[PDB]
Amino acid sequence: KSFQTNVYRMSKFDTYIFNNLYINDYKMFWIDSGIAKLIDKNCLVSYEINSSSIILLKKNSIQRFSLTSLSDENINVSVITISDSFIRSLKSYILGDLMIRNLYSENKDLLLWNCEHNDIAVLSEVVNGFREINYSDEFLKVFFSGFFSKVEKKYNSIFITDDLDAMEKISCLVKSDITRNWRWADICGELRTNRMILKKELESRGVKFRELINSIRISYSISLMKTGEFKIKQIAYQSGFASVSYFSTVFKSTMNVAPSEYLFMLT
């Protein structure tokens, strides 16, 4: 209930490409074997990852990156999405060393951690739905809080962001009424904050207002598909779009696949 997991297949030189992918909850992913090339267009860097490389994606970030297989054998990419309720049950473990956390920055939204075998084992059983070694809530809180702490320490940057951060307020507001016809005036009035102030959250992420709203609605539609909802026409309108055609165009530009192709990837 605290984790949502998926496994995707990559064949030889296959490439997943994401543009303006809004991260609605903390995510992490890794490959099970072989070598892959990760190109991060936000940080203008590229590097190779292996079966020990764990990639962390920060909540409320807007991602622009590609992942390419460099291996002959088929690669499985495992993606874990961590629920906000679980993340908040961690706020007592992290923040328990808080004024050392005050000296951190907040630029990095895509982090890399080279882990050992036991980390992969715990994370793999999470993706397996806890069907073999089940874990207690205490073990998982200690494991994940310790994991985030040492990755934050490595980059000297905040990963678990605070609840009163401006982009979190904007995101939670849009997600609480996804079909509302959002405009700048609605955000300013609900947050009682000047547009000169809120616009910094969009500029530092490289998005206009419509692309921000569109990106949140796309990640909303992805959560809907993950529940087993299969009717694309329903998903388009449930996510707040005005037409199936516009939803599919925005989805394709974000995910590089048509909505129906991703829905089948989830099975």
Ligand SMILES: Cc1cccc2cccc(/C=C/CC(=O)O)c12
């Ligand atoms: C994040 C990621 C990383 C690497 C490979 C991937 C392959 C397919 C889909 C996704 C993301 C799917 C949306 C989500 O899970 O919220 C993916």
